[PDB]
């Protein structure tokens, strides 16, 4: 689970690999069941006020 | 060794400079050149030489040398900034109930750290926003053989920046995370430079006299010559040698952006604090990623499998983990903030003292007797191009501290008294220049009878 | 990882990484082991195998 | 200990920061000559 | 203070090299004056650099030379103070 | 762990801020040894 924008990616994941992992540990993309897709997360926008 | 068994390097028994430190005076490096191996030696601290003491010799230099060096100071540091409760509690509603419950802590942090953000505007403004008005160099360059055109900025870039500075931003090399933003600084390099070339404008055309009041207009030539005056050498010094003088400046401005482009190494005090914020920010984030004894470090994964009532102490853990690893983050930050401050508040004296005046404190701006400097902004601090004089050759002279004249004995209004061998001569200390001894360069006290080591000769007066 | 090699006799100096191809539940102790050959027929005298 | 991640690099780094830094504090205030001065044989200061 | 993980690194310069540091700084200055903080160290006869020392400060040459015996005897018997005042008064070296 | 932890924490950050004030005073040693030792500083009651 988790929020963020998911955008088309050129990131060729390997068969082997189901989802990628950022220096932290979270999510920075996934591959999608039903249609094994290959999707790019980027935290959507925050800031001070 | 005294810091202890060192195993890989030949022991060599002549002595070298010391290229990497052991400790207890031992050093090591990589030769190359005699040895393609590792070899340890004891530190020399330098050449030795003695000095020719004698009770009635000087030495006086006969030439001398206008050298730039420069010196690179740290100002400000990037302004950043980290929410609490994104950065331990990223969008769960659940844990930050808990978070709540810490009181002010991380009210606290903030304040902390939006206090050092406000302050690298306040070191930036105090360093460079010394002058009221924006000063400006005229079309016609006739600086009496002078050639500013390193230093001033230059009208076809695109930025205007000088040429050394434009290195400088070209040798300086300097993200989305989750709560931690960075904010830009209140002014921009292009006002900075700007800033500068008001500085550099300012005390090309008018001296010293921009600091105090009204900037007033003297040409050049003039000005160097009472810089010169300021350091005890006579103007007909500069003004009998400005050819070669401004030769030799701008020489040593050329000189100086080739040293800068050719050894790195030279920006390393800004380059630091770029990295020691990288790198305080990278262990930051880094930190998220441990459990702390959590059953998953990542938060969602624990919240969405058990159920609040004992989940509760399994984000508490975390919790405390995090907030702990923050409060160190800026208990450091307040720190190297401090070091900062410091440097900026050198960089601030170092302005007034060495650029807006003719500063009398030695090694304060460079070695040698201090002619003038030029600032330089650089990414996050200040460069200053120190112009210094510097004696070059000297001759030992015979001396002694009086004449007897018709049983008078005369000492020096200004200088000292030399002789080759046969004739007697008064001159500057700085600068050999003899003259004939008269009454019109010594004064009268005493008698011969009193001071010890006094020579006979005859001084003229010109009224006879 | 498999790779066509140049190489005389020896491995090679280049570095390769290796890319996972399965993971067996297997879940049994192992030990020791033996690699499986593939040999030909030179010749049969009578009576050796 | 290894569940605390970096704690214990940041210590000894900033412990190696300050060590380091002890050695250019005595280098400033005292290397600032850059040859060894030699005083003469016969000490003629004129009484000092 | 050593026994279980702390331990205290050796100072890069050994006391006979920081001796030989303030030795040289020390002959510069009584050899030269502050001539070899700026360049070439240039030889001056010590009453002589006294002198213009004391013409930094408004009182001309001829001070000196008429009473350096009484200066030098002053001197002499002010530095000597100092080394009782150091082996007499404790505390001297809290800082 | 966790109290050992904090109480190196806690002396780190002491030695830090010492380490600080020591290093203001190294630089206003430095300061002194160029401008009272290299020079004769006009420069009232800084050095004496
Ligand atoms: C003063 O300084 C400069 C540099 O040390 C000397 O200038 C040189 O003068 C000679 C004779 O006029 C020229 O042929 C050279 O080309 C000059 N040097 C350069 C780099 O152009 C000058 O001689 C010095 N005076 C003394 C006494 O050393
Ligand atoms: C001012 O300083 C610079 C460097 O000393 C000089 O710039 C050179 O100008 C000429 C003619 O425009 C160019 O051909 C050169 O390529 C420039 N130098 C470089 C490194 O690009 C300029 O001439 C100087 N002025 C004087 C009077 O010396
Ligand atoms: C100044 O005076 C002294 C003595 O007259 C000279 O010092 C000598 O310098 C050379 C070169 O550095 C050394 O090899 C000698 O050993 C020194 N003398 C002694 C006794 O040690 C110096 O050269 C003089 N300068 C001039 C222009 O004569
Ligand atoms: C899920 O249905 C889609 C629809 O065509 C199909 O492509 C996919 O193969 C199905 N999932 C699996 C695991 O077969
Ligand atoms: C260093 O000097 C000593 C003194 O005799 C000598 O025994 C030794 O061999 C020398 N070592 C080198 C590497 O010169
Ligand atoms: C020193 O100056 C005198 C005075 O003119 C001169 O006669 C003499 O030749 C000079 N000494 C030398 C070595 O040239
Ligand atoms: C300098 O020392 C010499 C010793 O060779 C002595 O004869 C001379 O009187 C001294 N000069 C002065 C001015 O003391
Ligand atoms: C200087 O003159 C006095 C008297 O005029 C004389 O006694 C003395 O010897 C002279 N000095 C020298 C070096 O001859």
Not at chain 1, 13 to 29: S, V, Y
Not at chain 2, 199 to 220: D, N, V
Not at chain 2, 299 to 312: F, V
Not at chain 3, 2 to 31: C, K, Y
Request: net charge negative; glycine share 6%; charged share 15%.
């Amino acid at each position: 689970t988790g929020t963020g924008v998911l955008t088309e990616s050129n990131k060729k994941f390997l068969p082997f690999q189901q989802f990628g992992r950022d220096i932290a540990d979270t999510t920075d993309a996934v591959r999608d069941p039903q249609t094994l897709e290959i999707l790019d997360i980027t935290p959507c926008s925050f800031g001070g006020v | 060794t005294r810091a202890g068994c060192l195993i890989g390097a030949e022991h060599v028994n002549n002595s070298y400079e010391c290229d990497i430190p052991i400790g207890a005076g031992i050093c090591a490096s990589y030769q190359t050149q005699t040895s393609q191996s590792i070899i340890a030696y004891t530190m020399s601290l330098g050449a030795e030489n003695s000095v020719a003491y004698s009770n009635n010799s000087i030495a006086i230099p006969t030439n001398f040398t206008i050298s730039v060096t420069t010196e690179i100071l740290p100002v400000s540091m990037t302004k950043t900034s980290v929410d609490c409760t994104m950065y331990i509690c990223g969008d769960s509603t659940e844990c930050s109930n808990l978070l709540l419950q810490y009181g002010s802590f991380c009210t606290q942090l903030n304040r902390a750290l939006t206090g050092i953000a406000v302050e690298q505007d306040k070191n930036t403004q105090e360093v460079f926003a010394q002058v009221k008005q924006i000063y400006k160099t005229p079309p016609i360059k006739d600086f009496g053989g002078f050639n500013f055109s390193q230093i001033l900025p230059d009208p076809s870039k695109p930025s205007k920046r000088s040429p050394i500075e434009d290195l400088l931003f070209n040798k300086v090399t300097l993200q989305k995370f989750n709560g931690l933003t960075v904010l830009p600084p209140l002014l921009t390099d292009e006002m900075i430079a700007q800033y500068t070339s008001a500085l550099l404008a300012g005390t090309i055309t008018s001296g010293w006299t921009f600091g105090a009041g009204p900037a007033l207009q003297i040409p050049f030539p003039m000005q160097m010559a009472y810089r010169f005056n300021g350091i005890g050498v006579t103007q007909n010094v500069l003004y009998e040698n400005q050819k070669l003088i401004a030769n030799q400046f701008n020489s040593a401005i050329g000189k100086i952006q080739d040293s800068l482009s050719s050894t790195p190494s030279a920006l390393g005090k800004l380059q630091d604090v770029v990295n020691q914020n990288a790198q305080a920010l990278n262990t930051l984030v880094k930190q998220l990623s441990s459990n702390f004894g959590a059953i998953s470090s990542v938060l969602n994964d624990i919240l969405s499998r058990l159920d609040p009532p004992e989940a509760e102490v399994q984000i508490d853990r975390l919790i405390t983990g995090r907030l702990q690893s923050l409060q160190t983050y800026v208990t450091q930050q307040l720190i190297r903030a401090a070091e900062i401050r410091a440097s900026a508040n050198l960089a601030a004296t170092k302005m007034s003292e060495c650029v807006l005046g003719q500063s009398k404190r030695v090694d304060f701006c460079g070695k040698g007797y201090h002619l003038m400097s030029f600032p330089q902004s650089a990414p996050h601090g200040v460069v200053f191009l120190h112009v210094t004089y510097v004696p070059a050759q000297e001759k030992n002279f015979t001396t002694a501290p009086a004449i007897c004249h018709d049983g008078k004995a005369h000492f020096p209004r200004e200088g000292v008294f030399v002789s080759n061998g046969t004739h007697w001569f008064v001159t500057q200390r700085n600068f050999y220049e003899p003259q004939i001894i008269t009454t019109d360069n010594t004064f009268v006290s005493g008698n011969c009878d009193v001071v010890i080591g006094i020579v006979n000769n005859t001084v003229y007066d010109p009224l006879q | 990882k498999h790779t066509p090699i140049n190489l005389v006799r020896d491995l090679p100096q280049g570095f390769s990484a290796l890319e996972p191809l399965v993971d067996l539940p297997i879940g049994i102790n192992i030990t020791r082991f033996q690699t499986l050959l593939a040999l030909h027929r030179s010749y049969l005298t009578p009576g050796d195998s």
